[PDB]
């Protein structure tokens with residue numbers, strides 16, 4: 001219920017037992033990613049109009 | 051790796067023994083060269099609009115660090131486009147003339 | 152307060168070079184870890 | 194597994210050579226060899242030979258005293274002579290000088306094995 | 320149900336083997352066995368046999384000693400060898416090393432079961 | 446594009462490509478910053494380039 | 496502020512020994528795609544990944 005369909009099938013692929021930070025995914029609350037979030041959110045409004 | 055193709059062959063044209071201040075080149079941190087640097091990027095930003103300098107050229111200007119390379123890129127990109135506009139005027143002139151023919 | 156941030160800026164100027172020189176040393180450590188059969192680097 | 198590798202600090206650092214062992218000879222192996230790849234598709238190596246850079250150093254051949262004086266080899270076998278030219282480079286696989294020193298030394302055993310093979314080929318047909 | 324399952328911490332974690340108990344033999348069940356699924360579409364399995372990756376290890380067969388010396392089996396039947404080659408991974412079903420170890424161990428007893436069958440079918444026709 | 450360049454220009458690009466690299470490599474602005482502290486303490490500010 | 500980026504010190508300075516190394520790697524990257532791509536299906540796609 002809380003996961004999508006493609007998120008459910010990642011368990012089916014080899015070696016999910018290895019920390020996500022091996023695979024390129026980290027948890028991050030820094031100013032680099034909050035800057036990225038409004039840069040993608042005002043890019044959405046700039047693509048909403050036009 | 052830190053020099054170019056043309057920059058490494060300077061060692062062959064003679065006299066590199068002699069200091070650079072003998073050949074007209076000085077190290078200068080003074081208000082003349084920061085004013086010339088701030089002019090040469092403001093001139094490039096005024097040339098980015100009005101379609102005079104491409105987006106290929108301006109990123110070379112931002113990563114140049116020498117006031118004479120970034121001067122020659124303004125000169126080189128103006129001569130290329132003003133050659134292209136002069137031949138586009140020429141080909142549009144003969145096209146209506148061969149239509150007239 | 153900016154002129155009081157100058158009195159202690161020598162301590163950040165050495166420190167921002169130890170941050171430069173350690174990251175250069177961390178970069179060459181990773182380059183040897185490339186040629187060490189690690190599938191994380193892919 | 195230690196054969197041409199330096200397994201330290203959680204990594205697997207090799208110098209290039211492949212110590213091909215634990216299989217057996219061509220006659221004692223049910224698959225006639227170890228069959229490291231498919232190129233000749235049956236690329237078969239035995240328990241004693243050593244392979245560097247897609248070139249094989251044979252264990253059955255021997256070192257002539259003519260070919261021991263020139264090229265200055267150390268072992269009794271062409272396979273055993275490549276296991277002594279890599280003894281420096283086995284403990285320091287990432288050095289710039291050892292990899293240039295190995296490839297310069299692995300070429301001497303390469304031309305010596307090619308020269309000693311043509312001499313026995315010429316003496317067999319003669 | 321304890322057969323190849325680790326019911327701990329509120330979850331049902333398995334290693335992939337399917338201990339199929341409690342039913343009875345093929346002649347003792349009225350439905351001719353504890354059917355697993357529809358694919359032969361009546362796939363029947365009985366109380367002794369276990370399943371890993373849709374390959375079933377028969378409990379009715381016997382382990383020949385020559386089939387025991389190579390492939391290094393431990394049980395007295397093929398199911399009791401597959402009920403002993405999984406004793407590690409049934410308690411640690413999420414381990415990367417156990418599921419690599421169980422994958423290789425089941426490929427042994429699978430191919431050891433085929434060579435026992437091809438020896439059995441060749442004996443009866445001749 | 447090096448036909449529109451000049452000889453004093455190619456000498457000037459080579460001089461800056463030497464100087465822009467090694468200022469960033471050695472972090473030379475810190476070497477000059479320790480030298481100012483000897484300037485206010487001795488009256489001397491000396492460097493060797495070797 | 497914390498941005499510690501590996502940057503090229505002189506980015507407009509490309510020489511011969513830099514160029515002969517880049518052509519060597521693209522020869523290796525071309526070598527890989529002839530082996531991995533089932534021919535005529537993903538060979539145009541990996542080329543669009545390395546054009």
Ligand SMILES: [Mg+2]
Nearest residue numbers: 001002003004
């Ligand atoms: Mg949902």
Ligand SMILES: [Mg+2]
Nearest residue numbers: 051052508509
């Ligand atoms: Mg360069």
